[PDB]
Amino acid sequence: GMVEKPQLKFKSPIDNSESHPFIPLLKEKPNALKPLSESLRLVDDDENNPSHYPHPYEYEIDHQEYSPEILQIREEIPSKSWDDSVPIWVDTSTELESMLEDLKNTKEIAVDLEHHDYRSYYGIVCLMQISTRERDYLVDTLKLRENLHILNEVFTNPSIVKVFHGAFMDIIWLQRDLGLYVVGLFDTYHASKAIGLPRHSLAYLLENFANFKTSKKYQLADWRIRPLSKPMTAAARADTHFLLNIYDQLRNKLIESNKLAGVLYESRNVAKRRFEYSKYRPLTPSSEVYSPIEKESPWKILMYQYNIPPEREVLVRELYQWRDLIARRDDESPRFVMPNQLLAALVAYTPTDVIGVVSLTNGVTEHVRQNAKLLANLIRDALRNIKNTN
Ligand SMILES: Nc1ncnc2c1ncn2[C@@H]1O[C@H](COP(=O)(O)O)[C@@H](O)[C@H]1O
């Protein structure tokens, strides 16, 4: 019901302090063209972007040649009958070792991930789905967070195609939490765009090429929950179960129209994307680097102007910074700690005692309840500074 925070069980404790640029969790580097040595270094300051570590597989992604059977129009392979097998649950190092052995014997695999960001500061990968032509695997990325790095042997093997649909964030999530990278990517989203299909979503593809109606009733679900519910297990399996066949049809159509190279180019760039803490994000925002984005109100005085008075912007900002520090401290998301509507509510009514803060017509969060005095003090200070100054 309450769902105990899975972070508590991680072997390596999370760090939201952000005292340095992101450091790749990679310790071993298979399918390497350039030693891991030249990898873990640093790219000292510059106007464009401040000191940071580079993408450990950037070289191979540019140099590693593609498997020849990707440039060939081949007979497509139908997805396996859904009922002919059960998804294989993987949450043990041994189960993980056998799946790995199995993945090494493929020409291509379909991959997907499920993520959670409400009860975590940066967020956490809760599930990984991997399909072969024969079976569907469901990987518990919470319980095997520290072990999953061994999949790099396949995820970076250019001889095996890894099919994802719109992997722009997956690539980010894979390195940030599991130190996994991808070399040999084929993005079906970029494939759909190149061909010019009317719609480019996974759901559109599943409905038209696999006759599977999808449900947006899980892109808001809590993937941290163990065990997975039947309907959630089915929805996760569906993201990769039909993908290899969709891959065949799109690949062939691309070759047939001479647009494959462009898709592979687009895919290599999705794979080269690097993760960095907002504190060290490059000045000019680009699609080559990902830094945490605020899923809420515009930094400081929001545009959702709940009729936010003039003199009350210092207050607004202190609330924002306070919220962020607490979120980072307890490793929670800002909205869990205090949603903008509530932050706005405090600014609008400016309660100055505990009673005023907890009885806010809007209702209150646990963090605001536990810090009611601090907030009432913070607010009282803000007012006094107003009546004063001018
Ligand atoms: N519509 C959405 N709103 C919010 N988060 C989403 C949405 N779609 C996907 N996500 C997040 O992205 C993860 C992967 O979704 P997908 O790319 O559709 O497999 C989910 O488990 C969510 O954490």
Ligand SMILES: [Mn+2]
């Ligand atoms: Mn996905």
Ligand SMILES: [Zn+2]
């Ligand atoms: Zn999914």
